[PDB]
Amino acid sequence: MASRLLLNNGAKMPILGLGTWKSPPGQVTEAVKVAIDVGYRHIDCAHVYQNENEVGVAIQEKLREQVVKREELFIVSKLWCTYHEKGLVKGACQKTLSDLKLDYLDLYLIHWPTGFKPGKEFFPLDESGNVVPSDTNILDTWAAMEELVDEGLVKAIGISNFNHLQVEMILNKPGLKYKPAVNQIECHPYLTQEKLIQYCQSKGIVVTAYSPLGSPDRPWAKPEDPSLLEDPRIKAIAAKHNKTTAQVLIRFPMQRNLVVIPKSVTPERIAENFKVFDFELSSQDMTTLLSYNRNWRVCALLSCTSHKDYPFHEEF
Ligand SMILES: NC(=O)c1ccc[n+]([C@@H]2O[C@H](COP(=O)([O-])OP(=O)(O)OC[C@H]3O[C@@H](n4cnc5c(N)ncnc54)[C@H](OP(=O)(O)O)[C@@H]3O)[C@@H](O)[C@H]2O)c1
Ligand SMILES: O=C(O)COc1cc(F)ccc1C(=S)NCc1ccc(Br)cc1F
Numbered sequence: 001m002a003s004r005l006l007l008n009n010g011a012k013m014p015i016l017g018l019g020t021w022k023s024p025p026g027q028v029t030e031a032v033k034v035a036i037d038v039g040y041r042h043i044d045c046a047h048v049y050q051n052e053n054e055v056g057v058a059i060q061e062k063l064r065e066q067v068v069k070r071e072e073l074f075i076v077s078k079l080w081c082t083y084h085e086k087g088l089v090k091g092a093c094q095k096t097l098s099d100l101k102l103d104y105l106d107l108y109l110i111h112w113p114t115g116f117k118p119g120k121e122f123f124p125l126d127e128s129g130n131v132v133p134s135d136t137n138i139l140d141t142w143a144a145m146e147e148l149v150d151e152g153l154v155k156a157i158g159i160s161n162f163n164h165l166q167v168e169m170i171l172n173k174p175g176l177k178y179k180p181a182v183n184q185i186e187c188h189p190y191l192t193q194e195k196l197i198q199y200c201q202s203k204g205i206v207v208t209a210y211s212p213l214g215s216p217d218r219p220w221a222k223p224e225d226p227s228l229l230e231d232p233r234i235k236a237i238a239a240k241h242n243k244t245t246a247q248v249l250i251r252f253p254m255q256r257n258l259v260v261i262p263k264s265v266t267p268e269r270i271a272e273n274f275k276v277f278d279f280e281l282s283s284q285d286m287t288t289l290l291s292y293n294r295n296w297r298v299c300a301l302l303s304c305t306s307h308k309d310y311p312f313h314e315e316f
Contacts, residue, residue: 161311
């Protein structure tokens with residue numbers, strides 16, 4: 001199929017990108033270099049991952065080497081929860097731009113819908129371990145994001161981990177100037193997100209699927225959690241196509257018209273994950289993979305469940 005999807009701003013976003021959460025600073029530079037060489041043109045970043053400077057070094061080297069031109073790359077970062085206050089949004093964006101060594105971002109996302117107390121700590125906690133919320137509401141944060149488009153810092157703005165009521169709040173904002181281009185959410189065969197995806201797609205919002213392999217390096221993994229990569233039913237579908245299970249898990253969201261951003265720092269796996277354009281899962285394989293849904297979420301956090309804007313109390 002097409003390798004890019006059209007956003008509501010007229011820009012084309014590559015459907016496969018490289019994730020960078022948990023990529024150590026001493027390895028992410030090489031990872032990104034190898035990815036660009038092999039053909040990736042979309043990199044998913046965030047300030048909170050604490051490695052944007054090192055991503056930036058990789059991007060600059062490949063621009064300087066003339067392997068790629070800036071306009072061919074699609075670089076995404078995210079506004080952290082401690083910067084939801086209207087006056088802090090621009091500064092947070094500029095810090096990211098400085099670390100990545102760029103003069104504009106292609107897409108800037110609100111990372112989570114919940115605002116936290118501003119400060120140096122990414123997760124400010126109270127004396128009993130609850131996250132300290134800020135009194136900012138998401139509509140005011142959105143207005144600040146829209147000003148970054150007008151100022152030329154970012155080409156498109158979007159959201160991440162927003163449920164459908166939270167998306168609706170933005171779409172019904174008085175004076176809405178730029179609709180969200182993308183909603184980046186957790187999506188894989190154990191959390192298929194049919195309802196939320198259909199909602200978003202109906203509204204012309206592109207969905208990006210994160211943790212498509214089930215994030216087996218997540219820091220809070222437990223020894224007897226489910227493993228997608230070792231699910232024997234998925235292994236059988238892979239075997240039938242002579243692909244790896246990872247390749248099947250990456251191709252899956254592509255055929256649902258989603259963008260997908262697997263993470264790897266391993267050069268062989270970076271190349272393997274890119275070889276997904278030469279095969280098709282059947283309708284039958286797609287429906288079967290959808291049937292494996294268990295509403296199991298990698299990305300959730302108990303310390304934040306008391307926040308009024310925590311997204312996962314809703315059905316979708
Ligand atoms: N918006 C948000 O809230 C949100 C939250 C979570 C994730 N994200 C984004 O989504 C990206 C992807 O999600 P994720 O990092 O949670 O995990 P993921 O991409 O589902 O899985 C990463 C794990 O899979 C391993 N892996 C990669 N390709 C493989 C292959 N071909 N065979 C076997 N193992 C393979 C990686 O190993 P190696 O690295 O050792 O090779 C790593 O341990 C993140 O990096 C981040 O950019 C955004
Ligand atoms: O968030 C990422 O992209 C990947 O995850 C993270 C990435 C980081 F670099 C630091 C913490 C997280 C965590 S703990 N994310 C879980 C989480 C954070 C805030 C809220 Br509201 C709910 C929630 F579930």
